[PDB]
Amino acid sequence: LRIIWGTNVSIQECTTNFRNFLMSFKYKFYYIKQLNEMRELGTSNLNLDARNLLAYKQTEDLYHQLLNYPQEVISIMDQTIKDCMVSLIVDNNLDYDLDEIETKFYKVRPYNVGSCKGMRELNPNDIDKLINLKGLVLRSTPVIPDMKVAFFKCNVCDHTMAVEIDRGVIQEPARCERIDCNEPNSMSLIHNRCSFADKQVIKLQETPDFVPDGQTPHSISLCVYDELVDSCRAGDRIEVTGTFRSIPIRANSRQRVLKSLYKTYVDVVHVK
């Protein structure tokens, strides 16, 4: 079952328990035709619906397991439906010329799972969960470059070896590649050459239509990624979805020390 941490959601089950989830209207109280229309367009980006696994079985609990640990289940889901999009390929056999559309990545966009009210009601007790949120877009922050695979060199030999950045961190070997050489020479990181992806940020008011009355609405901190970057212009109350995230910050300034209170934003999975 592949037990994982405290998330403890079984791999090679959810994939399968989602695999029979295929072909249901049903009920309701699409489905596979969305999966079907997706492939000709090659747009990737599964739109989903949610509620899906609620209330239909299988995976009536997995609907909760994603709410509980979205970081995991989204990984599993995208991973699975990559292969399910592969599984639809076997019926028409050779498709799209050919296996490269299987190389093209996919991702799930879960939205509207429960409705949690505002940033005001938000709590530490749940630091990971998807949230229905509103309020008008204030401004679009400039496009933020983001670290994926860091590129390196030295004067030794000089050589081109590069490594993944992984979590936000950078660990290069002090020395050295190629060859060998070795040698004491410090690693040369090209700032520019390394792999990058698009991230952004938006500040958002909480439900300006609604007030706890009288106090000012707290500020939603959102970021997103990919398409969601430059999603919409601003002044849009509408709706927002994503799991919570928070990170401590360095203080004075520099100094390499923590401020011991976590800056709180949203992983902002989707907006509709």
Binding site: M147, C157, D158, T160, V169, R233
Partner: protein, 267 residues
């Protein structure tokens, strides 16, 4: 202590001799009344009438030789591949013309892209963008290479140190000077060029009110510097890249830095 062994550029070198061919082998459309011969030989030897240390070539024409497949590798991997285009040109004109620092410019690009269109994929790649000037800033020199040494007490080592800081020399000297130490900065042997920062603003006609167009800097490196005038929209060369002031290099913060090796005032 022997140095072994240098590497490589591989494909970049293949593109070195291939782009060497293209820059030498035409690069021409019409025979006779053309638009023939080379036209670049005519252009570089006319560029030797001057020696302003710069060139003009069409990317559209760059397509034709390989059908643009080389134009690809020079399309996304461009930043990676620059050092070869130049010294390859220099290798070619070393057959023709001789105090030389050569500056590449590519124009007539496939399509104009928006600032809203600006994404991380474009890094190290040519792209055409246009829009209105904001705040041209005074021109101040580009280090390129410097002479700084010693380095304890005179190593007189002069070359490179072209990194973006731009400090410092004193790296792995002399021998035997063993610096560390001071660089020590030698300014006089350093050849300089350009440069001014001009922040472009996104044009109003395209931007979707209400918007408040989000805009970034166009840096003018190359003799194409200063040609701009405030208020005008102008075709630019892409070179997305990045700038230092979220990640940190554990033994930081970065943002979009738009450059162009080529610019035209059209728009």
């Amino acid at each position: 202590l022997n140095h072994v062994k240098k590497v490589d550029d591989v494909t970049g070198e293949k593109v070195r001799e291939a782009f060497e061919q293209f820059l030498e082998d035409f690069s021409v459309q019409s025979t006779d009344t053309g638009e023939v011969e080379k036209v670049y030989r005519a252009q570089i030897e006319f560029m030797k009438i001057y020696d302003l240390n710069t060139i003009y070539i069409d990317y559209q024409h760059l397509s034709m030789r390989e059908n643009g497949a080389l134009a690809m590798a020079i399309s996304e991997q461009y930043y990676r591949f620059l050092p070869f285009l130049q010294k390859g040109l220099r290798r070619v004109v070393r057959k023709y013309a001789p105090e030389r620092v050569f500056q590449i410019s590519f124009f007539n690009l496939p399509t104009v892209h928006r600032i809203r269109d600006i994404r991380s994929e474009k890094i190290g790649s040519l792209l055409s963008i246009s829009g209105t000037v904001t705040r041209t800033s005074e021109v101040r020199p580009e280090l390129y290479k410097a002479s700084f040494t010693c380095d304890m007490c005179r190593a007189i080592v002069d070359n490179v140190e072209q990194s973006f800081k731009y400090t410092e020399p004193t790296f792995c000297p002399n021998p035997s000077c063993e610096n560390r130490a001071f660089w020590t900065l030698n300014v006089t042997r350093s050849r300089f060029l350009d440069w001014q920062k001009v922040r472009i603003q996104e044009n109003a006609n395209e931007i979707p009110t209400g918007s408040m167009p989000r805009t970034l800097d166009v840096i003018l490196r190359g003799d194409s510097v200063e040609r701009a005038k405030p208020g005008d929209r102008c075709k630019f060369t892409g070179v997305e890249i990045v700038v230092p002031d979220k990640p940190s290099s554990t033994l930081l913060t970065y943002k979009i830095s738009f450059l162009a090796c080529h610019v035209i005032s059209i728009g």
